[PDB]
Amino acid sequence: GTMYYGFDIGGTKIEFGAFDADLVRVARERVATPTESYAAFLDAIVTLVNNADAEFGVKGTVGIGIPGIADVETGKLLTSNIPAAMGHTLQRDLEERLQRPVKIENDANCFALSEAWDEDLRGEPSVLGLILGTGVGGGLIFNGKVHSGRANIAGEIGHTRLPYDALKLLGMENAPIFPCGCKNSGCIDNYLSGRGFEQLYDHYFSEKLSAPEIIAHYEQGERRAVQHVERFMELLAICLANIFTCLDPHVVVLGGGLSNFELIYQELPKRLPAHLLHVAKLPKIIKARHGDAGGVRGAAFLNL
Amino acid sequence: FQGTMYYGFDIGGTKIEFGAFDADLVRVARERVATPTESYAAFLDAIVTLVNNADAEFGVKGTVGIGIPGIADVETGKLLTSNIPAAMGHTLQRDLEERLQRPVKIENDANCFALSEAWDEDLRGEPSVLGLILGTGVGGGLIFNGKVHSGRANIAGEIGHTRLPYDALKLLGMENAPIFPCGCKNSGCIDNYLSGRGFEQLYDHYFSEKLSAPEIIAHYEQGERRAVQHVERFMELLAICLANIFTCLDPHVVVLGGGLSNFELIYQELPKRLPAHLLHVAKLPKIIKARHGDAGGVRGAAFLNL
Numbered sequence: 001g002t003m004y005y006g007f008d009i010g011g012t013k014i015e016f017g018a019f020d021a022d023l024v025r026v027a028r029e030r031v032a033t034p035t036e037s038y039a040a041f042l043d044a045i046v047t048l049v050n051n052a053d054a055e056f057g058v059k060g061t062v063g064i065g066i067p068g069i070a071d072v073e074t075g076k077l078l079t080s081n082i083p084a085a086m087g088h089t090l091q092r093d094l095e096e097r098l099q100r101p102v103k104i105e106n107d108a109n110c111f112a113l114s115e116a117w118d119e120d121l122r123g124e125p126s127v128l129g130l131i132l133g134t135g136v137g138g139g140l141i142f143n144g145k146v147h148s149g150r151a152n153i154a155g156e157i158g159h160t161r162l163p164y165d166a167l168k169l170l171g172m173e174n175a176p177i178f179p180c181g182c183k184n185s186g187c188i189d190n191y192l193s194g195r196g197f198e199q200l201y202d203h204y205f206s207e208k209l210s211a212p213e214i215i216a217h218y219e220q221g222e223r224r225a226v227q228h229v230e231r232f233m234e235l236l237a238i239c240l241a242n243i244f245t246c247l248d249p250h251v252v253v254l255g256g257g258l259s260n261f262e263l264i265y266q267e268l269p270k271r272l273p274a275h276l277l278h279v280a281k282l283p284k285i286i287k288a289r290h291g292d293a294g295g296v297r298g299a300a301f302l303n304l
Numbered sequence: 305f306q307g308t309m310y311y312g313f314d315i316g317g318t319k320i321e322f323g324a325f326d327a328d329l330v331r332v333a334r335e336r337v338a339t340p341t342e343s344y345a346a347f348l349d350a351i352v353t354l355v356n357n358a359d360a361e362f363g364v365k366g367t368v369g370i371g372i373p374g375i376a377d378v379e380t381g382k383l384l385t386s387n388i389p390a391a392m393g394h395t396l397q398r399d400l401e402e403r404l405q406r407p408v409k410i411e412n413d414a415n416c417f418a419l420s421e422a423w424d425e426d427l428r429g430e431p432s433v434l435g436l437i438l439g440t441g442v443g444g445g446l447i448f449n450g451k452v453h454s455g456r457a458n459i460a461g462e463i464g465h466t467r468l469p470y471d472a473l474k475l476l477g478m479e480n481a482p483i484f485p486c487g488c489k490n491s492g493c494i495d496n497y498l499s500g501r502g503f504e505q506l507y508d509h510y511f512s513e514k515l516s517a518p519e520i521i522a523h524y525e526q527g528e529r530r531a532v533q534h535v536e537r538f539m540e541l542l543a544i545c546l547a548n549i550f551t552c553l554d555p556h557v558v559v560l561g562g563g564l565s566n567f568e569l570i571y572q573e574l575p576k577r578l579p580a581h582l583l584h585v586a587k588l589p590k591i592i593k594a595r596h597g598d599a600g601g602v603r604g605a606a607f608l609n610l
């Protein structure tokens with residue numbers, strides 16, 4: 001008999017949801033992520049909670065999915081695509097402002113948790129939730145339970161470096177080596193995300209187009225976009241084949257902005273086998289069943 | 305009467321190790337034979353003989369669990385085992401079930417190792433354990449909340465067949481880096497770099513002499529120039545590659561097994577070198593040498609049948 005709030009915080013947008021005691025979604029809000037000012041970042045979150053509390057006449061529970069890691073010892077955030085939040089004790093800061101406990105979990109973990117709880121995936125021995133947004137994130141579920149890892153880093157596939165076969169595709173010593181918000185270089189976060197898709201286009205063609213614009217040019221059969229999409233589909237297959245040789249997930253669920261690129265679901269099953277072991281069988285690869293809400297739902301229900 | 309007996313096999317490229325464990329799980333037999341490398345019939349014979357002999361010795365029909373490098377196809381049961389040429393492409397489980405007239409369980413070697421190591425009372429309650437074999441190849445066994453994740457197609461933990469990451473290539477000279485062919489038929493898999501065999505191949509690549517890992521390590525201990533250069537390069541390469549793996553898996557405990565796990569310097573150097581390549585907020589896992597020595601494979605295989 002509560003109200004449960006969830007936040008799904010990404011590099012560019014914050015999604016907010018409120019769910020009643022029967023878990024029905026009764027609020028839905030979206031705001032831009034403040035990426036520069038930490039004060040503005042906190043304000044955005046606090047406003048949404050306060051507004052919802054005023055609307056429903058309650059003090060809602062607060063679960064937040066963050067695009068990054070709260071240090072397991074200090075609580076300070078590493079959010080590679082949110083400069084504003086870097087180094088701050090988000091949980092503590094919010095508990096102060098909102099005068100109640102706050103649970104923080106990684107965004108991809110929340111997404112994976114929600115998607116794995118779907119009746120269709122109940123009973124699957126493993127599920128990998130993959131977010132391809134401003135960054136690349138993974139949530140690892142084994143027998144229905146999240147593996148969050150020794151230091152809340154499990155599933156941080158975005159901060160693994162391009163594998164040799166991917167570098168080969170991109171031209172080896174001539175490959176674009178993109179800087180990462182984690183301060184490393186060549187992290188796949190900057191290649192397979194919708195942002196990375198854009199950066200790869202710009203690197204090869206010297207024009208700053210959005211992912212939806214490139215995809216639209218692709219749909220028209222425009223030469224540069226067709227070349228870009230071929231390169232990207234192969235890069236995606238190579239990188240995910242490496243990850244699947246380590247993790248071998250039963251089901252892979254894709255979320256984030258770039259998960260709306262329908263071609264991915266056609267091309268991945270065709271391109272993965274060449275890069276997997278000979279006896280590998282493909283995982284079930286599906287688009288998010290909860291649309292754009294799995295992160296919010298996962299976050300909200302941390303307080304269940 | 306003897307009671308229930310559990311047999312385990314650790315099948316390697318050169319030798320087959322057998323163990324029989326009684327109902328109290330005490331090891332009461334230990335046998336080692338050459339791995340038949342050509343004839344599959346000879347391979348099966350070696351295994352069947354050990355089971356039959358042990359059965360005759362103890363007056364029982366023991367359960368049979370087998371650890372082997374490579375993968376039994378999840379659909380066909382055919383083995384993908386590049387390092388066991390005799391068994392490649394064969395339905396080992398079915399063939400043995402016919403010969404031995406009882407069920408046979410087949411598991412990956414690194415999975416067996418991880419299962420045995422994680423069952424230790426001190427690890428049994430850890431939220432995750434990664435068993436890593438550094439031997440002729442590089443293999444991983446992934447345990448989450450005390451249960452092995454064997455994966456969609458029995459491939460979970462095949463970290464040896466992931467390709468060198470960019471930061472590792474950079475260390476090795478990028479377009480001038482040695483790109484070793486792999487038994488899986490890919491190129492640049494870490495199986496051929498971080499294993500004891502890989503350690504040797506890297507030495508040979510840079511120095512053109514085919515020394516064994518123990519020879520190189522002994523030269524290193526004497527401060528010989530080439531070995532010192534090799535070991536520095538290798539320690540950094542190992543840290544880079546494992547940092548990539550740990551950023552994906554973030555294991556609570558990592559247990560090292562296989563021949564190269566005997567190189568003690570690894571346990572000193574990894575904690576020093578990993579942080580630079582991990583995320584800023586990463587905390588190191590507990591990194592330990594195998595608590596069961598060279599026996600975790602046999603024990604893990606035997607106890608598949610517990």
Ligand SMILES: Nc1ncnc2c1ncn2[C@@H]1O[C@H](COP(=O)(O)OP(=O)(O)O)[C@@H](O)[C@H]1O
Pocket residue numbers: 009010011012013014132133134135193194195198210211212215255256257258259260261
């Ligand atoms: N329908 C779409 N098709 C393809 N790419 C999209 C689509 N919507 C958003 N994107 C891209 O996804 C990225 C943004 O990721 P998203 O998950 O929306 O949020 P966040 O920035 O919070 O991670 C951008 O590259 C954006 O252009």
Ligand SMILES: Nc1ncnc2c1ncn2[C@@H]1O[C@H](COP(=O)(O)OP(=O)(O)O)[C@@H](O)[C@H]1O
Pocket residue numbers: 316317318438439440441499500501504516517518521561562563564565566567
């Ligand atoms: N004590 C040791 N110190 C260092 N390396 C070792 C040691 N013993 C074996 N090795 C190396 O480990 C590799 C052998 O792998 P091992 O685990 O013995 O068998 P398998 O071939 O079944 O994996 C070889 O490179 C060997 O030289």
Ligand SMILES: CC(=O)N[C@@H]1[C@@H](O)[C@H](O)[C@@H](CO)O[C@@H]1O
Pocket residue numbers: 010011066067068069078079080081106107108131133134135136137138156158159182189583
């Ligand atoms: C260290 C870091 O910032 N990682 C985040 C990751 O947690 C998140 O899941 C992903 C997608 O939003 O983007 C980033 O890679």
Ligand SMILES: CC(=O)N[C@@H]1[C@@H](O)[C@H](O)[C@@H](CO)O[C@@H]1O
Pocket residue numbers: 277372373374375384385386387412413414437439440441442443444462464465488495
């Ligand atoms: C595909 C293949 O042969 N992989 C094996 C792996 O199963 C084993 O665990 C590892 C260590 O023995 O060596 C190889 O990497």
Ligand SMILES: [K+]
Pocket residue numbers: 106108109137138139140153154155156
């Ligand atoms: K994660």
Ligand SMILES: [K+]
Pocket residue numbers: 412414415443444445446459460461462
């Ligand atoms: K394995």
Ligand SMILES: [Zn+2]
Pocket residue numbers: 080158159160180181182183184185187189
């Ligand atoms: Zn990074």
Ligand SMILES: [Zn+2]
Pocket residue numbers: 464465466486487488489490491493495
């Ligand atoms: Zn390989």
Ligand SMILES: [Zn+2]
Pocket residue numbers: 519
């Ligand atoms: Zn010598």
